[PDB]
Design a protein around this ligand. Structure first.
Ligand SMILES: NC(=O)c1ccc[n+]([C@@H]2O[C@H](COP(=O)([O-])OP(=O)(O)OC[C@H]3O[C@@H](n4cnc5c(N)ncnc54)[C@H](OP(=O)(O)O)[C@@H]3O)[C@@H](O)[C@H]2O)c1
Ligand SMILES: NC(=O)c1ccc[n+]([C@@H]2O[C@H](COP(=O)([O-])OP(=O)(O)OC[C@H]3O[C@@H](n4cnc5c(N)ncnc54)[C@H](OP(=O)(O)O)[C@@H]3O)[C@@H](O)[C@H]2O)c1
Ligand SMILES: [Ca+2]
Ligand SMILES: [Ca+2]
Lengths: 419, 427
């Protein structure tokens, strides 16, 4: 029975907890990993994920995941009478690692995003969204040239939730303050939002992007910003990112505005090109010239937009994995949300949730092999035309498979593999 | 002739009649005055080409019943040369009198001339059609992209309200927010303000809906991130749906009604009015472009979506555009002055031709001119009779000069079979 309160404290029976100390992380081969089923298609895809990884971890014995169910969204509301229990947040903070499905957020009305509350409460400041081609039917002619990682700032920007309705007294006070003190005029019938971008949040992120690039061998890191129009938030974001790159990683980093002076127009091998692109231009560039970009560093909103756009190029967000990464704590979560029209239809693509599960367990926790069996199986299922409707659409002849039958295909690919 | 520098020199050309705007009605005579501004860099070359192509088109389809009377106004380097200033008030007054204008790109002074024009004339709606003309394109489904983006062009984070992180202004704002609302903002943060208003949103959506009725568009999609920004983007969405039901009820049906009141089977005749969360909208134009036509968006969202759409279609150098207000429109290409091509007879004039086609064909109601110009451009591309920007993606193809491409388009227009080219596309 899943925990409703802080009083209901209870790591699953036969499992030690993941630990974090001195910088390093310890994964006991007996780890507790928290799971939230989520909303809409969520329960469907989370149910694939554990099943699928439970077959993967079984191949290459010493280990096994003990899944620990925590409640958020409709299931928390049906059981605890609230949407995001203190305990759910505590329980992830205790397990240190979690896998979550999508949570519903109402538009214009209702409660603030529970996905954002989790990211903000748990300080998961880096949203890491790899964009990869696995052979799936795709709308982009050169989808196989997209191989990217988005480092999306996960705490501030308009996501801070600072805004007031147009007809609130609070909006009217801000209108009055801005008119009297700075001579700024805002219409009486305007809603008002505030956009903060800080030095601390952007540096933090850029540093993680930098080290991610050095660990994987990435050679280009691109800052996506609309700094020509928003000089003091987006432009500042760009300046602060360049600054840390040159301060802490000088030897590993080069500028474009330098390559064209000291390196005769060509990026020297062993040195990461650090460049930047105006946000609308960046959207065009991933479409027109995808092979020229690798690590993309963005404030919260730009990062949200670019990651959805890039995943669509390679087949849609049905394949799009994610990781909300903080210092010694991560929560795996697909790019895609709730997809309510597909909710209880056995149609949805579980790949994104499975690959988030693999990104957590593989890259973060350290079980690299679960990543590759993880990748091999999807690759095989894909490069054979056994796919859910979202991929099957972008190809003639290809009959589509249900969620359950796609997952039972993956399972068989895992159990029957030459390691 | 000689273009005007002063109000008193303002005289629309002989043979022409002024487009009128009285009530909410645009009255376009058979011999309409249309202002044009040559502009800077490649501007004169592409404007010149657009006048010639458009004139051949109107003569062909209307057989001398109709004829545009072009009226030259100055802005940019020609205004400097002739008048001593970059943007004479007379040019603004000229556009206001004419109601319709084609302009070339303008150079940014070392305040921006384009922004000064939209503000003086209150051109609040930025309109960007995105269509496929047969170009080499990175989208497998490029030929399924046929869209128009209605982008609100006055508010949002583009209003310019923001302060540096170390300003005393920013510190005052941090203090004010902390004391009055208990909001904490970091000491090292830049601060921007995002306003979205009922009035600007309604005007925009109204123009979008009117376009949808005019052109037979059957879907209008509101792009917003209203789940996160409840009171700006969420309000935009709510206000846009609201005027659709208030001022277009009988013509319109809502996606919420379709799933609830109907079978999922959108009632025949009606324009579907729906909405997509902005990140999904970016995915949707790439995965399911055929489901979208008119897209209505706040300033930033509109900027991002129209550029992404143009990239799908290989139309970046070819993108047409228009800024529209109440009785008034100025068409111009998306592209800039392309200074290294200037005067070289190498530039692609298609974007400017298509801005003219947008102005005349779509805003002035002269449909047949749109149909035949688009017919000619598609035929040129199919024939590989194109300028270097397109020819570079066509192995072995000898590129045409601007002037040669212009004359090729004219010959396709002149020799066209209107029985075929205007089937369903007249009146
Ligand atoms: N943080 C999160 O986990 C998360 C993420 C995004 C959204 N959300 C929330 O979810 C709700 C839905 O918003 P939305 O409809 O804009 O976004 P969405 O749930 O991501 O749905 C967008 C579209 O993507 C496709 N799609 C998504 N997941 C798929 C999968 N697993 N397999 C195959 N196709 C898939 C479907 O496309 P087609 O229609 O073209 O078939 C779907 O209509 C909102 O309340 C939003 O706030 C939560
Ligand atoms: N419409 C407007 O009034 C407006 C809009 C934007 C910019 N501008 C102004 O224009 C100036 C231009 O700046 P820029 O240096 O960035 O040059 P640009 O005008 O943006 O052109 C850059 C590149 O785009 C390609 N290109 C653009 N339009 C093309 C077309 N019509 N046909 C074929 N190729 C085309 C060219 O070829 P390659 O890519 O092969 O080199 C060119 O080098 C700026 O000062 C800016 O203020 C004005
Ligand atoms: Ca998103
Ligand atoms: Ca733009």
């Amino acid at each position: 029975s899943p925990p409703c309160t802080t009083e209901e404290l209870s790591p699953p029976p036969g499992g030690s907890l993941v630990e974090y100390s001195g910088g390093s992380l310890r994964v006991p081969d007996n780890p507790v990993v928290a799971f939230i089923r989520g909303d809409g298609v969520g329960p469907e895809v989370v149910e694939s994920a554990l099943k699928v990884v439970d077959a993967a971890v079984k191949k290459v014995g010493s280990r096994r995941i003990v899944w620990w169910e925590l409640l958020a969204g409709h299931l928390a509301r049906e059981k605890c009478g609230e949407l995001l229990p203190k305990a759910t947040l505590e329980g992830i903070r205790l397990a240190r690692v979690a896998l979550k499905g999508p949570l519903e957020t109402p538009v214009g009305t209702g409660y603030r995003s529970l996905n954002v509350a989790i990211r903000q409460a748990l300080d998961l400041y880096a949203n890491i969204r790899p964009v990869r081609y696995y052979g799936q039917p795709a709308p982009h002619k050169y989808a196989d040239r997209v191989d990217m990682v988005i480092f999306r700032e996960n705490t501030e920007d308009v996501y801070a939730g600072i805004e007031w309705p147009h007809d609130s007294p609070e909006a009217a006070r801000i209108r009055r303050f801005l008119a009297e003190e700075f001579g700024i005029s805002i219409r009486e019938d305007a809603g008002i939002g505030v956009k903060p971008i800080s030095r601390f949040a952007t540096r933090r992120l850029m540093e993680r992007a930098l080290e991610w690039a050095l660990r994987n061998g990435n050679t280009v890191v691109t800052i996506m910003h609309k700094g020509n129009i928003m000089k003091y938030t987006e432009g500042a974001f760009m300046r602060w990112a360049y600054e840390v790159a040159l301060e802490k990683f000088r030897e590993h980093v080069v500028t474009e505005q330098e390559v064209q002076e000291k390196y005769g127009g060509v990026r020297p091998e062993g040195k990461i090109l650090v460049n930047d692109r105006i946000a609308d231009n960046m959207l065009q560039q991933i479409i027109t010239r995808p092979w020229d970009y690798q690590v993309i560093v963005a404030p919260n909103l730009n990062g949200d937009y670019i990651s959805d756009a890039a995943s669509a190029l390679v087949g849609g967000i049905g394949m799009a994995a994610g990781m909300n990464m903080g210092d010694g704590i991560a929560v795996a979560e697909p790019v895609h949300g709730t997809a309510p029209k597909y909710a209880g239809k056995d149609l949805i693509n579980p790949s994104a949730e499975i690959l988030s599960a693999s990104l957590l367990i593989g890259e973060f926790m350290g079980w690299r092999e679960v990543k590759s069996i993880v990748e091999y199986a999807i690759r095989k299922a894909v490069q054979s035309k056994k796919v859910t409707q979202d991929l099957a659409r972008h190809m003639p002849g290809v009959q589509p498979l249900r969620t359950s039958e796609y997952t039972e295909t993956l399972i068989a690919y895992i159990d029957e593999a030459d390691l």
